[PDB]
Amino acid sequence: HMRAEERERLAEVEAALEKQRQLAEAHAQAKAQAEREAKEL
Amino acid sequence: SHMRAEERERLAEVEAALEKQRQLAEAHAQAKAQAEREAKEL
């Protein structure tokens, strides 16, 4: 029953933060993979 | 010239992994700037 404006704002910010977190982890995983494989050269 | 195929494969793999990392770094940076801009509305 909260104002649609606030509801939409909170959702959009939450979603952007989640995207950032996901990509942070994806990047960390890719770095770990590259580093592992480099030390197997 | 004296490198085995397996090592050529490993080099190609590392090169591809470094590129995946580079692209994800850019993507993450873009997500971060996006989140910063969105959080201004709070």
For chain A, the domains span 1-41
Return the ∠ at Cα A9 (arms to B32 and B34), rounded to 5°. Answer: 15
* Residue A37 neighbours by CB under 8 Å, 6+ apart: B10, B13, B14, B17
Please give the method by which this entry was determined: X-ray
Q: At what angle do helices B5-39 and A4-38 cross, to 10 degrees?
A: 160
Alpha-helix runs per DSSP H in chain A: 4-38
* Residue B13 neighbours by CB under 8 Å, 6+ apart: A37
Cβ contact (<8 Å) for A26 and B31? no
Which chain A residue has its CA at the smallest distance from B21's CA?
A30
Resolution (A): 1.7
Q: Let me know: does A37 contact B13? Beta carbons within 8 Å.
A: yes
Q: Which residue shows structure tokens 């994800």? A: B24
CATH of B1-42, one of 3.40.50.300, 3.40.50.1980, 1.20.5.580, 2.60.120.10: 1.20.5.580
- Calculate how close chain B gets to A8, using CA atoms only, in Å: 11
Q: How far is CA B27 from the centre of its chain?
A: 9
Nearest-angstrom CA–CA distance, A10 and B36: 14
